[PDB]
Design a protein around this ligand. Structure first.
Ligand code: CLA
Ligand code: CLA
Ligand code: CLA
Ligand code: CLA
Ligand code: CLA
Ligand code: CLA
Ligand code: CLA
Ligand code: CLA
Ligand code: LHG
Ligand code: BCR
Ligand code: SF4
Ligand code: SF4
Ligand code: SF4
Lengths: 738, 75, 165, 39, 144, 80, 75, 61
């Protein structure tokens, strides 16, 4: 029986526990004796497993926490809309998108920082934004600042509702454990109601507001002169003036004569040629199809009536001869362990974000987006980074499950058990394939460097010497370009210009052209494969050996996060799964930095540029230069950092400052990464003596950071430094040459 | 030497060479001084002289080196 | 003057840099309307630029061969040639405020060590006692030299040391 | 209310209030007295 | 109490076979063999990875190092309240009993034990490294 | 083999014994402390030098000390 | 005797920073080689030992050799 | 030796609380080598606030 189950008034709303730091932990509620306490207080603040053993209380805590997160995000969205309405040039940009730079941040005139308010056009001065909100707002049909202001107030109201919902569902009416364990009902409601009704209501908004307003905006009529959306809902005769299908109403829908809705539910493909974005009619049909699909999908699992599937029965039904008991026991694991769920959801959520990056660069969904090169670079890079971080998190929480929640006396000869039982074979094969990939992928680059340096270019791996053509990718590309003719008859064009074909340009700039693939693309793709495989190796090794290894047979009893097991047995530093997350973080940074460099150079070289033929931003140097390390060093890094290094005295000077600052923070991380806390503790001893001499020794004893906190501080400053460096480089480059 | 300082690459190479040689040799001086303290220092054969009185005020030494390092770095 | 430096009111590269910055600001200015907000902002920027160059030439700063103000850090040379307001008066101003902060922190520590929970006062600040010591710390150099002369500024050799001292 | 002022007496809250006061005082000084290099 | 003997014909726990098992150290140098008597049939965690069903009665497992046998001993002793003992086996067939070599577990005092490696002084009363220079080898001053 | 020493500041709390993952230490009769128990290291040939014993000891300073000496196949923790 | 100015000022104070910091690490390695409060019997392990384990908060890079190691970066 | 509750001072040079002040808990009257039990208000690097000392390692100061 699926029903609402709630306990009344569990936790009194009181300011008492605000005044007692570390109340949540029996160890930390004793008070601070040394400085380590503070760090512990913040590190274990949200580790609810270390607070209680009771799954119900933990579940309630995570529920209200999620509400807090949603309220924060709503505050953030409210801020973006309010700043877009009050401190922007959005209307001016609407009147001239091709020659006005999107700006929605202005600085105050103090200490000379006023110079950052640059000439972005439209009679405005501010910081040019690259988040892409302007294109999203134009695509949604927003025309005035008033509507943005109203959206800001609405989002603030929703933030207040989310914080009230958090307080309410923790302190007043907090759900019971068997409410949270209704996973079949949760999937039904989220697949129907969330994704399904979400895309249904959005398709409603599109068909009724987006399509007419953007059709008029593409027609050329002044935005203020375009009818307001409520007049588009109210008087259907205007909707019939743009698309005569609307004259017949919803009569073709119920009578199944859906073909008459082909005015606004299309299958054109390609891009809008005057606008450089996907057709909103294609997007409307897409969201209608997505809606119907998800609402069908949301009626799959049995709840309070006989019909519907059961998750444990589907899992226990798939058993073979090679795997033994198969998927038995997995339902119990995924309905009692939050960390397993978090690992799965983080992996797929990160992967999904990377897919979002690729599909949004390749098939520009917003108008005047493809030619806002800064926005495209920013969006791709951003969502790729977010993706990578969520994948590393997935590996982390997988390992946390493996140490804290794994219990083999309910999990005995299972898929998980066999994985743990042949982990040596898995890791050794992954090891070998990583070394193989490293040798041949990186070795081609080193080979080319040597041959080019020795004056023998005919012996290189290139398009003119020893060729290594991406035959398979070229074949898939050609097939997808020829797809509208035979295997997709109702498609007018291909799904993306990059497959092949003509060229769509807007305002003299290239929106998208066919992307060619040669030896350089072969080499970078195998570099990507190598780095990804190594990252998977580290993380997977971390999760498979989290409990035990031949080195530490009882590693599980030492916890998930611990520094080592002493200098014996040769040395056991970084044996914990946490340390494997730490190394996977560095390798994830490596991989995604090479990925975004690939994207940046390739787009600036073979795609972007002006139309007179097409003059590219870097003239097409990718195909001959991206085969040597010196080529990346000179033609990419050195050449394209001109803009960042000479940005002083202009509006881009902040990117130079953050270039230097990011380099500094990156180097600053090396002190934590390369050293150890014994030295620092002894140094602190001397300093403590000096403070004792002058009666200024604190009652809370100064302690050097822990080993694991030294590693954490190290990797955090390392990531912040490197990522912010590439951020400043990218933004200054693409804003100046864009 | 004659027609040195008109060969500029020679100037840069010789200066950089002997400066890095000097840096490694100074770090080795302090390293073998620590090795002296660990292996060869007898405190009973040095009861009250200058070398034991350096170990007696070592916290003031390390504290004032810490102060000049922090001052020069911050400013 | 000092070290072969010309005064900034006499330096030519100083006036050249002033004219160059005004030229950059008016090249940014000449692409707007007359009474618009970017025009008002850039005219306020030009006003502050002219006022800043007039104030630096007024104060008797020394410029180099590039037209930039140079500072003199020697007490007697700056007191002799009238450059005391750039290092000497700033260094005694800094020593006043830095010793203020240090003396207020030291008095807070000695005030909270005499209780049953010194660490609990270190985490959660006694705000009335902190404000009382913050207002009383204006006579910190007098109280500092008085604690120096009584021998109560220093702890004796009851400090923590290592076995070879 | 006693516990709310005890929470406001904690270290990061007071550090936030005090650095907001100090930074705002420096910002108002650099506004009304633009660009001081000497004196 | 007398020193027990190894029965090689003791039934092993129910286990499908891991990749973390023995290596050539078992054939060339040594391998260690653990034995306990169980009260009921119950799943335990193998220290080399995976789950295993123990049999009701005597059990027998062989590991590669001593720490694996201590980890299984600690698991079977703190979680299941059992009394195991693990041996040392050479490829000749030589059997060396240990843990508990006294018969009583070392976490409680028993008469008859002789104290080994006990310095009867403080740690601050060690000599300086100048006093032990130029011996036959490296010496820490705590060796004397 | 590593060097493990026991010093007379031992208070026979048995913490070091229950911390060793290799069964090297044991408690012997003694008369130097109220607990009438002292640690002893009769099996230092199997010691790897992990120093869990030193972590478990409450006394200040340590009453058990591990001096990492010459490595063997047992002290390196090798299963191969 | 090259003509000098405020860049030469800033770089000579950066040089003083580097020298005093490297001297801090090297002198602190020479003097805390006999032992510190975190490790009073450091003379009993020698000059170059890995660590003393994760106990007492963790003791990584506690030997005088490790102070040399950390000071070569500053050199 | 010293009495319960009295303040003493530690002269063991390889101790964390050398040249510092603690409080006597008890003195064992047997032939134990380190009978003086002294608690300290601050903990060492191992988180311990109690140590045993000899008679010539404590001074009631
Ligand atoms: C406004 C009235 C109010 C009051 C008096 C309380 C009081 C309490 N809550 Mg409740 N609760 C409330 C509203 C309130 N809550 C709201 C709005 C939510 C949804 C978030 C919750 C959800 C909730 C959960 C899940 C839990 C509590 C718990 C508690 C108890 C202890 C928590 C504590 O003392 O730390 C106080 C914490 C803070 C003062 C810090 C707030 C952190 C904010 C939310 C994060 C956002 C800051 C933001 C990111 C800015 C950062 C900028 C930059 C520097 C990064 C205490 C009785 C806990 C409990 O009962 O344990 C037994 C517990 O587990 N509350
Ligand atoms: C959520 C993200 C977000 C971000 C990053 C920004 C960022 C900015 N805003 Mg925007 N804004 C936002 C959302 C955001 N805003 C929202 C949701 C609204 C509607 C309420 C606004 C309405 C708004 C206006 C009207 C203005 C800005 C302005 C600014 C700029 C300067 C802010 C400043 O100096 O304030 C002043 C600084 C302070 C008030 C510091 C005091 C902080 C206190 C002391 C902390 C105390 C700690 C306490 C426990 C926690 C806070 C509790 C809280 C209830 C007070 C800065 C770019 C200004 C601007 O753009 O100028 C051109 C401006 O005029 N914002
Ligand atoms: C069809 C109804 C429905 C909808 C739309 C949702 C939607 C959501 N649930 Mg789910 N939930 C449902 C039924 C539903 N739930 C049922 C029946 C159960 C019990 C089996 C759960 C148990 C559950 C748990 C344990 C959690 C969620 C969470 C979430 C949020 C995921 C965050 C996100 O990406 O959304 C995008 C964000 C939005 C779309 C914002 C709009 C949200 C508003 C409130 C509309 C959603 C409708 C809402 C359910 C109606 C509430 C009415 C209320 C006044 C009584 C999302 C808002 C997670 C969460 O974040 O909690 C805070 C979470 O931890 N749900
Ligand atoms: C999912 C979101 C969504 C929403 C909200 C709408 C809404 C609408 N569509 Mg649209 N439509 C959609 C998706 C959506 N559509 C999609 C996906 C397609 C493609 C197939 C279309 C294709 C389409 C066409 C071709 C047309 C519409 C039309 C309409 C309008 C009239 C429909 C109607 O008569 O419904 C039936 C009436 C109701 C459902 C009434 C609602 C119930 C009321 C509010 C209850 C009130 C009760 C309360 C007690 C009384 C108030 C008391 C209070 C005052 C105190 C309406 C604004 C028509 C139009 O006007 O175009 C401009 C039209 O011609 N739609
Ligand atoms: C650029 C510096 C650098 C290099 C060369 C390496 C190299 C490697 N890392 Mg390392 N790593 C690095 C930075 C680097 N890493 C940093 C900064 C960290 C700290 C975050 C790590 C942390 C780390 C982790 C966690 C892991 C690695 C692993 C590896 C190995 C991957 C396997 C492989 O591809 O073999 C191929 C070898 C190469 C690509 C090296 C260059 C080979 C040249 C080009 C050809 C060799 C022929 C040569 C010229 C002949 C010389 C003859 C001469 C001697 C006479 C590889 C040796 C992984 C591993 O070992 O698992 C498989 C692993 O898991 N590293
Ligand atoms: C560029 C990288 C970098 C930087 C900045 C430092 C800086 C320092 N090192 Mg480190 N070191 C480094 C690399 C670096 N090191 C590397 C690669 C190693 C090899 C592992 C070491 C090994 C090492 C040793 C062995 C020692 C040092 C010491 C020091 C300190 C020397 C005294 C000083 O100059 O204080 C000036 C302070 C700075 C230059 C740091 C900047 C502080 C900023 C300006 C303050 C905060 C600003 C802002 C408000 C923060 C906002 C952040 C926001 C999130 C809140 C200084 C903090 C020594 C020490 O501790 O002496 C006391 C010491 O013994 N370092
Ligand atoms: C940090 C170290 C330092 C250094 C290297 C200098 C360097 C100098 N001082 Mg300055 N000074 C300093 C700190 C320093 N000062 C401090 C802390 C004070 C306050 C006590 C002064 C107060 C002061 C006065 C009143 C005068 C100088 C003067 C000078 C210049 C020549 C002095 C000389 O020839 O004697 C050798 C240098 C030293 C012994 C270094 C210490 C300087 C002492 C404190 C003063 C020496 C003054 C000198 C006897 C008078 C020379 C008269 C001149 C006409 C020949 C020289 C550039 C003189 C000047 O203006 O020349 C143009 C001068 O009249 N200084
Ligand atoms: C640590 C080295 C250092 C030093 C010595 C200075 C010094 C100065 N800076 Mg610089 N600056 C620094 C680091 C430093 N800064 C850093 C790290 C940054 C990046 C964050 C900056 C970014 C910066 C900017 C953007 C500006 C300055 C400005 C100034 C001048 C401010 C004078 C003032 O505040 O009014 C006087 C201050 C007070 C009256 C407050 C003190 C209150 C007490 C009670 C007075 C007591 C007096 C007796 C002063 C010369 C301003 C300037 O125009 O320079 C010419 C300016 O606009 N600084
Ligand atoms: C090929 C893999 C076939 C995998 C396959 O067909 O598995 C199918 C095989 C049969 O499973 P059952 O029929 O017993 O499954 C029953 C249930 O458990 C699942 O429904 O499962 C295994 O035996 C797992 C053994 C994996 C053996 C290692 C394969 C490693 C391949 C790594 C290389 C991948 C390179 C390409 C990556 C994109
Ligand atoms: C200017 C001039 C002058 C002067 C000069 C002088 C006076 C100089 C000085 C110089 C000096 C004054 C130098 C010194 C240096 C030093 C050093 C550089 C040191 C180092 C040290 C060390 C390295 C240590 C070591 C050790 C240890 C650690 C332990 C114990 C042992 C030993 C001791 C070995 C004249 C008059 C001629 C004339 C005019 C010009
Ligand atoms: S302390 Fe640092 S170094 Fe010594 S073992 Fe533990 S981790 Fe490795
Ligand atoms: S060694 Fe440390 S722990 Fe083991 S008994 Fe003696 S005192 Fe108790
Ligand atoms: S080091 Fe490892 S083995 Fe040697 S004693 Fe301490 S714990 Fe037992």
């Amino acid at each position: 029986k699926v029903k609402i189950a709630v306990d009344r008034n569990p936790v009194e709303t009181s300011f008492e526990k605000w005044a007692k730091p570390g109340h949540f932990s029996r160890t930390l509620s004793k008070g601070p004796n040394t400085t380590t306490w503070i760090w512990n207080l913040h590190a274990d603040a949200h580790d609810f497993d270390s607070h209680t053993s009771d799954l119900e209380e933990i579940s309630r805590k995570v529920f209200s926490a999620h509400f807090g997160q949603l309220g924060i995000i709503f505050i953030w969205l409210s801020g973006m809309y309010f700043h877009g309405a009050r401190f922007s040039n959005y209307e001016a940009w609407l009147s001239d998108p091709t020659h006005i730079k999107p700006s929605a941040q202005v600085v105050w005139p103090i200490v000379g920082q006023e110079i950052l308010n640059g000439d972005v056009g439209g009679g405005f001065q501010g910081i040019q934004i690259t988040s892409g909100f302007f294109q999203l707002w134009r695509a949604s049909g927003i025309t005035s600042e008033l509507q943005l202001y109203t959206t800001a107030i609405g989002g603030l109201v929703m933030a207040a509702a989310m914080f009230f919902a958090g307080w309410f569902h923790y302190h007043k009416a907090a759900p019971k454990l068997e409410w949270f364990q209704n996973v079949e009902s949760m999937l039904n409601h989220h697949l129907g109601g969330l994704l399904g009704l979400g895309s249904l209501a959005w398709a409603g908004h599109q068909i009724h507001v987006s399509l007419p307003v953007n059709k008029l905006l593409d027609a050329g009529v002044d935005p203020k002169e375009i009818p307001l959306p409520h007049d588009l809902l109210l008087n259907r005769a205007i909707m019939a003036d743009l698309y005569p299908s609307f004259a017949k109403g919803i009569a073709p829908f119920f009578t199944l004569n859906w073909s008459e809705y082909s005015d606004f539910l299309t299958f054109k493909g390609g891009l809008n040629p005057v606008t450089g974005g996907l057709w909103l009619s294609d997007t409307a049909h897409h969201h209608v199809a997505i809606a119907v699909l998800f609402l069908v999908a949301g009626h799959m699992y049995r709840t309070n009536w006989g019909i519907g599937h059961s998750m444990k029965e589907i899992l226990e039904a798939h058993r073979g001869p090679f795997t033994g008991e198969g998927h038995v026991g997995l339902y119990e694991i995924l309905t009692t362990s939050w960390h397993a769920q978090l690992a799965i959801n983080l992996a797929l959520f990160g992967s999904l974000s990377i897919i979002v990056a690729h599909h949004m660069y390749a098939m520009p969904p917003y108008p005047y987006l493809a030619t806002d090169y800064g926005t495209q670079l920013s969006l791709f890079t951003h969502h790729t980074w977010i993706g990578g971080f969520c994948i590393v998190g997935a590996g982390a929480h997988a390992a946390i499950f493996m140490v804290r929640d794994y219990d083999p006396t309910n999990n005995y000869n299972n898929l998980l058990d066999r994985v743990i039982r042949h982990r040596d074979a898995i890791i050794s094969h992954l090891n070998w394939v990583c070394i193989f990939l490293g040798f041949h992928s990186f070795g081609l680059y080193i080979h080319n460097d040597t041959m080019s340096a020795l004056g023998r270019p005919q012996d290189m791996f290139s398009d003119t010497a020893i060729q290594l053509q991406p035959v398979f990718a070229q074949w898939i590309q050609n097939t997808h370009f020829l797809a509208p003719q035979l295997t997709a008859p109702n498609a007018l064009a291909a799904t993306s210009l990059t497959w092949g074909g003509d060229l769509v340009a807007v305002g003299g700039k290239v929106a998208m052209m066919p992307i060619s693939l040669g030896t350089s693309d072969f080499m970078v793709h195998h570099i990507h494969a190598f780095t990804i495989h190594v990252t998977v190796l580290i993380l997977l090794k971390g999760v498979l050996f989290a409990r035990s290894s031949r080195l530490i047979p009882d590693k599980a009893n030492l916890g998930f996060r611990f520094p080592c097991d002493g200098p014996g047995r040769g040395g056991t530093c970084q044996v914990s799964a946490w340390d494997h997350v730490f190394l996977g973080l560095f390798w994830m940074y490596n991989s995604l930095s090479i990925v975004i460099f690939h994207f940046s150079w390739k787009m600036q070289s073979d795609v972007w540029g002006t139309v007179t033929g097409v003059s590219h931003i870097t003239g097409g140097n990718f195909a001959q230069s991206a085969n040597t390390i010196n080529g990346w060093l000179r033609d990419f890094l050195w050449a394209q950092s001109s803009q960042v290094i000479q940005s002083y005295g202009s509006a881009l000077s902040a990117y130079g400052l953050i270039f230097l600052g990011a380099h500094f923070v990156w180097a600053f991380s090396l002190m934590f990464l390369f050293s150890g806390r014994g030295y620092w503790q002894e140094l602190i001893e001397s300093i403590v003596w000096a403070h004792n001499k002058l009666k200024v020794a604190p009652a809370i004893q100064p302690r050097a950071l822990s080993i694991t906190q030294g590693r954490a501080v190290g990797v955090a400053h390392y990531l912040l430094g490197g990522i912010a460096t590439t951020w400043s480089f990218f933004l200054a480059r693409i804003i100046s040459v864009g | 030497y004659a027609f040195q300082a008109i060969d500029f690459t020679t100037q840069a190479a010789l200066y950089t060479h002997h400066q890095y040689i000097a840096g490694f040799i100074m770090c080795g001086a302090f390293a073998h001084g620590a090795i002296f303290f660990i292996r060869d220092y007898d405190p009973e054969q040095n009861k009250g002289n200058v070398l034991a009185r350096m170990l007696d005020h070592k916290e003031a030494l390390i504290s004032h080196l810490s102060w000049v390092s922090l001052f020069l770095g911050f400013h | 003057d000092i070290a072969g430096l010309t005064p900034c009111s006499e330096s030519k590269a100083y006036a050249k840099l002033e004219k160059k910055e005004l030229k950059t600001l008016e090249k940014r200015l000449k692409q707007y309307e007359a009474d618009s907000a970017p025009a008002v902002a850039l005219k306020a920027t030009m006003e502050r630029t002219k006022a800043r160059f007039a104030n630096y030439a007024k104060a008797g700063l020394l410029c180099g061969n590039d037209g930039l103000p140079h500072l003199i850090a020697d007490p007697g040379l700056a007191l002799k040639y009238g450059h005391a307001g750039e290092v000497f008066i700033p260094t005694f101003g800094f020593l006043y405020v830095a010793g203020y902060i240090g003396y207020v922190g030291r008095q807070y520590l000695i005030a909270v060590k005499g209780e049953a929970k010194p660490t609990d006062k270190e985490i959660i600040i006694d705000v009335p006692l902190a404000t009382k010591l913050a207002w009383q710390g204006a006579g910190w150099p007098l109280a500092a030299v008085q604690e120096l002369q009584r021998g109560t500024l220093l702890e004796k050799e009851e400090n923590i040391t290592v076995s070879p001292r | 209310m006693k516990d709310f002022t005890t929470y406001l007496s904690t270290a990061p809250v007071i550090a936030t209030i005090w650095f907001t006061f100090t930074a705002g005082l420096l910002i108002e000084i650099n506004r009304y007295f633009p660009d001081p290099l000497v004196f | 109490w007398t020193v027990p003997t190894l029965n090689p014909d003791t039934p092993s726990p129910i286990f499908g076979g891991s990749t973390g098992g023995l290596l050539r150290k078992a054939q060339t140098e040594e391998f260690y063999v653990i034995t306990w008597e169980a009260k009921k049939e119950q799943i335990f965690e193998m220290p080399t990875g995976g789950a295993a069903i123990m049999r009701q009665g005597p059990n027998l497992l062989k590991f590669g190092k001593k720490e694996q046998c201590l980890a299984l001993t600690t698991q079977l002793r703190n979680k299941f309240k059992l009394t195991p003992c693990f041996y040392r086996v050479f490829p000749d067939g030589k059997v060396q009993y240990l843990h508990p070599a006294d018969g009583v577990y070392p976490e409680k005092v028993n008469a008859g034990r002789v104290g080994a490696n006990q310095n009867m002084r403080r740690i601050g009363q060690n000599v300086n490294p100048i006093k032990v220079k130029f011996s036959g080898r490296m010496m820490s001053p705590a060796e004397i | 083999a590593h060097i493990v020493k026991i010093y007379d500041t031992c208070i026979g709390c048995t913490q070091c014994v229950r911390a060793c993952p290799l069964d090297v230490l044991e408690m012997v009769p003694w008369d130097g402390c109220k607990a009438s128990q002292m640690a002893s290291a009769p099996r230092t040939e199997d010691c790897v030098g992990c120093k869990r014993c030193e972590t478990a000891c409450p006394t200040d300073f340590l009453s058990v000390r591990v001096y990492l000496g010459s490595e063997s196949t047992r002290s390196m923790g090798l299963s191969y | 005797f090259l003509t000098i100015g405020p860049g030469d000022f800033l770089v000579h104070h950066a040089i003083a920073l580097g020298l005093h910091t490297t001297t801090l690490i090297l002198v602190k390695g020479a003097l805390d080689a006999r032992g510190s409060k975190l490790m009073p019997d450091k003379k009993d392990f020698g000059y170059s030992f890995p660590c003393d384990g994760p106990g007492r908060g963790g003791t990584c890079d506690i030997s005088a050799y490790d102070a040399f190691y950390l000071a070569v970066f500053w050199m | 030796g010293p009495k319960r509750g009295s303040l003493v001072k530690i002269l063991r040079p390889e101790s964390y609380w050398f040249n510092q002040v603690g409080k006597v808990v008890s003195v064992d009257q047997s032939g134990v080598r380190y009978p003086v039990v002294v608690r300290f208000e601050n903990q060492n690097y191992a988180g311990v606030t109690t140590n045993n000392y000899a008679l010539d390692e404590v001074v009631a100061a």
